Amino acid sequence: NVKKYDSTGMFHWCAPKEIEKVILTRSEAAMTVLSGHVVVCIFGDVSSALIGLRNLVMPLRASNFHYHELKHIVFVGSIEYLKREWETLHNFPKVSILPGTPLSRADLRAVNINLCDMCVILSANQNNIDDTSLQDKECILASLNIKSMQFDDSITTGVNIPIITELVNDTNVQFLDQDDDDDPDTELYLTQPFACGTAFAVSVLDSLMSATYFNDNILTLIRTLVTGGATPELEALIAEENALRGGYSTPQTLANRDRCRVAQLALLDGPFADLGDGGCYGDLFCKALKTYNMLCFGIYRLRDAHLSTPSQCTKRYVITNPPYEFELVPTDLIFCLMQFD
Amino acid sequence: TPELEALIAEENALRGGYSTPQTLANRDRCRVAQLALLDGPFADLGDGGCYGDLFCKALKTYNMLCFGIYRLRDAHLSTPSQCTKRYVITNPPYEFELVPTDLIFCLMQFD
Amino acid sequence: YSAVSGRKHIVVCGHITLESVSNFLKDFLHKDRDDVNVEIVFLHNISPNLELEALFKRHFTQVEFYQGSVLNPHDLARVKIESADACLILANKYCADPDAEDASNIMRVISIKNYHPKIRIITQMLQYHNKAHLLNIPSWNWKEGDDAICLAELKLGFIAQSCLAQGLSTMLANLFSMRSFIKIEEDTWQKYYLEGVSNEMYTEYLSSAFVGLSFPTVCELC
Ligand SMILES: [Ca+2]
Ligand SMILES: [Mg+2]
């Protein structure tokens, strides 16, 4: 019948396909129209090592997603590399693939990166090169290429487009932005890009071991928020058949996909706007609780919103769990956690 | 010209479109040219031996702007021979001799 | 280093070795040029060996050295780029794998731009395909105070532009090496050739008296 819920209330599912059915070219990219989507740029060659594309798209396709508010995904890279992996993830709705190289200023214009909602760059060959100064070259150069690509017609300047890169050697983080007070001595959690939330590295995870040992269940909770949920049944089947499967809907399966959701809410509109000048984050918290129970645990605010002189730079930084009395500027964002499907 | 540079970077390939009046005029860029001696009107001053005599009359009526002399490698010896390699001399003074067999670097005006 | 008022200092960085330093310094300080008033500052992360010490000492009044790197934003504060005028970049022409060399040069440009946007840069490159990426970095200004000199492009350009007329390659290439006139008396070709070897190409503003005249006429007048 429906065949949309992979035998468990966790992900959506459909029938397998073939590469020709999804492989597009530049002409169709011109013909088609996209909006508010995500593009992933993957470098590498066939001689490079495998990287686990399976897990990325997974939480994006959670069963907490209305089919009319989905997110589309497009990959950009070399097709010969991608074929080596697509045998893994060939069962998900609304995925597209494009040959080329993320360096082509022309090619990315086809995917309409201008009006996207997200971007992400991954490297794979970094584990074979010897000199630490050599890798991350393509990632950085592509990042700046995006940041500087002029547009015409909303959004007009390469700074406005968000981007979430990734890199291996920590220090290189000093190249991601221009107006940064770079330094090699400062350790990572204080330099501008990271707290701006436009950078990441594997090093910061190393602390988990510590917090792992003092409490068993912590590691589970994170796997809840991040991957969307791994009940024992799902991992059992994953180990069993090496690939996901899907049965028909059941009365319990329909009730299964009732799990809360992380999201964002603006202020310049909506019923909460009357509280925009409220000024007390606690007032927002309690008022949200009594009407929607929306847990509020983060303020994402403009970098230069605190000075006196006006300006136009549009990066943002994060504050977690502030005290009861913290002034709110009308223009900023708060993290939220919804509870309905 | 910057215009080509921009297009070159963006499309990763040169591209062309139907010509327009402005595009047609563009080709007035001058070209590098070589000119022989023993033929043509200039050959009247074949044994003139004055690079200046050629220089004044060259561009005065043809915009034929000459700056380089190209000469046989054994063009000065008394004994004759047949080797056919040639060297280059740039911007000679006003009073340099010119044998009846030489080549002139030059710039040609128009299309 | 220290900054002295009334003068100007530049910087270099890259493939520093005896051959390259000798050639560059010879061309830079040659007496035929207009009265030169600059100083030269080097950087490198390998302590120079004894042989090169000879050159770095012999011009005791015009060359200074400072060990360090170019990727460390402390080193690029020692050299005082913030008051410089340019930063050339020697690039290794005879490399084994071309790609790594230009990649490293790219990152060098990236870092130097990171420390300051309003700087002047003149560098080298090895294949036209990778030259374009340098167009992308945010503050290069091709229109104002910036440039880039490839090799492959200029190489094939000389050859091709000489395809229409023999020897044009040599005539161009000799115009950009500083040379002095010589005496030869033997009636070979060498004397007549050195007659024109030592010519060079310069620029200067015109005179106001020549505005209202004809380009052919002013050429003949000149
Ligand atoms: Ca940076
Ligand atoms: Mg001194």
UniProtKB/Swiss-Prot annotation, chain A:
What is known about the tissue distribution of this protein? Widely expressed. Except in myocytes, it is almost ubiquitously expressed.
Region feature (Segment S9): 33-53
- Renumbered to this chain, motif Calcium bowl spans 165-187
Which residues does the record give as Ca(2+) binding sites? 174, 177, 180, 182
How would you describe the post-translational modification of this protein? Phosphorylated. Phosphorylation by kinases such as PKA and/or PKG. In smooth muscles, phosphorylation affects its activity. Palmitoylation by ZDHHC22 and ZDHHC23 within the intracellular linker between the S0 and S1 transmembrane domains regulates localization to the plasma membrane. Depalmitoylated by LYPLA1 and LYPLAL1, leading to retard exit from the trans-Golgi network.
Q: Where is the RCK N-terminal domain?
A: 35-153
Q: Which residue intervals make up region (Segment S10)?
A: 194-214
Subcellular localization is given as: Cell membrane
Comment field on protein domains: The S0 segment is essential for the modulation by the accessory beta subunits KCNMB1, KCNMB2, KCNMB3 and KCNMB4.
Q: What else is known?
A: The protein was initially thought to contain two functionally distinct parts: The core channel (from the N-terminus to the S9 segment) that mediates the channel activity, and the cytoplasmic tail (from the S9 segment to the C-terminus) that mediates the calcium sensing. The situation is however more complex, since the core channel also contains binding sites for Ca(2+) and Mg(2+).
Q: What does this protein do?
A: Potassium channel activated by both membrane depolarization or increase in cytosolic Ca(2+) that mediates export of K(+). It is also activated by the concentration of cytosolic Mg(2+). Its activation dampens the excitatory events that elevate the cytosolic Ca(2+) concentration and/or depolarize the cell membrane. It therefore contributes to repolarization of the membrane potential.
- UniProt record similarity statement: Belongs to the potassium channel family. Calcium-activated (TC 1.A.1.3) subfamily. KCa1.1/KCNMA1 sub-subfamily.
Please give the name of this protein: Calcium-activated potassium channel subunit alpha-1
Swiss-Prot record, chain B:
On tissue specificity, the annotation reads: Widely expressed. Except in myocytes, it is almost ubiquitously expressed.
Identify the domain of life.
Answer: Eukaryota
Which cellular compartments is it found in? Answer: Cell membrane
* Modification after translation (UniProt): Phosphorylated. Phosphorylation by kinases such as PKA and/or PKG. In smooth muscles, phosphorylation affects its activity.
**What is the associated disease?**
Paroxysmal non-kinesigenic dyskinesia 3 with or without generalized epilepsy: An autosomal dominant neurologic disorder characterized by absence seizures, generalized tonic-clonic seizures, paroxysmal nonkinesigenic dyskinesia and involuntary dystonic or choreiform movements. Onset is usually in childhood. Patients may have seizures only, dyskinesia only, or both. Epilepsy, idiopathic generalized 16: An autosomal dominant form of idiopathic generalized epilepsy, a disorder characterized by recurring generalized seizures in the absence of detectable brain lesions and/or metabolic abnormalities. Generalized seizures arise diffusely and simultaneously from both hemispheres of the brain. Seizure types include juvenile myoclonic seizures, absence seizures, and generalized tonic-clonic seizures. EIG16 is characterized by onset of seizures soon after birth or in the first years of life.
How does the annotation summarize its subunit structure? Homotetramer; which constitutes the calcium-activated potassium channel. Interacts with RAB11B. Interacts with beta subunits KCNMB1, KCNMB2, KCNMB3 and KCNMB4. Interacts with gamma subunits LRRC26, LRRC38, LRRC52 and LRRC55. Beta and gamma subunits are accessory, and modulate its activity.
Swiss-Prot/TrEMBL domain comment = The S0 segment is essential for the modulation by the accessory beta subunits KCNMB1, KCNMB2, KCNMB3 and KCNMB4. The S4 segment, which is characterized by a series of positively charged amino acids at every third position, is part of the voltage-sensor.
From Swiss-Prot, chain C:
Q: In which tissues is it expressed?
A: Widely expressed. Except in myocytes, it is almost ubiquitously expressed.
Q: Give the start-end ranges of region Segment S7.
A: 156-176
Query: Per its UniProt entry, which superkingdom is the organism in?
Result: Eukaryota
Q: Give binding positions for Mg(2+).
A: 39, 62, 64
Q: Where in the cell is it found?
A: Cell membrane
**How does it get modified after it is made?**
Phosphorylated. Phosphorylation by kinases such as PKA and/or PKG. In smooth muscles, phosphorylation affects its activity. Palmitoylation by ZDHHC22 and ZDHHC23 within the intracellular linker between the S0 and S1 transmembrane domains regulates localization to the plasma membrane. Depalmitoylated by LYPLA1 and LYPLAL1, leading to retard exit from the trans-Golgi network.
Q: Where is the RCK N-terminal domain?
A: 7-149
Of which family is this protein a member?
Belongs to the potassium channel family. Calcium-activated (TC 1.A.1.3) subfamily. KCa1.1/KCNMA1 sub-subfamily.
* Subunit structure comment from the entry: Homotetramer; which constitutes the calcium-activated potassium channel. Interacts with RAB11B. Interacts with beta subunits KCNMB1, KCNMB2, KCNMB3 and KCNMB4. Interacts with gamma subunits LRRC26, LRRC38, LRRC52 and LRRC55. Beta and gamma subunits are accessory, and modulate its activity.
Q: Which disease is it linked to?
A: Paroxysmal non-kinesigenic dyskinesia 3 with or without generalized epilepsy: An autosomal dominant neurologic disorder characterized by absence seizures, generalized tonic-clonic seizures, paroxysmal nonkinesigenic dyskinesia and involuntary dystonic or choreiform movements. Onset is usually in childhood. Patients may have seizures only, dyskinesia only, or both.
Other notes = The protein was initially thought to contain two functionally distinct parts: The core channel (from the N-terminus to the S9 segment) that mediates the channel activity, and the cytoplasmic tail (from the S9 segment to the C-terminus) that mediates the calcium sensing. The situation is however more complex, since the core channel also contains binding sites for Ca(2+) and Mg(2+).
This chain's source organism reads Homo sapiens (Human)
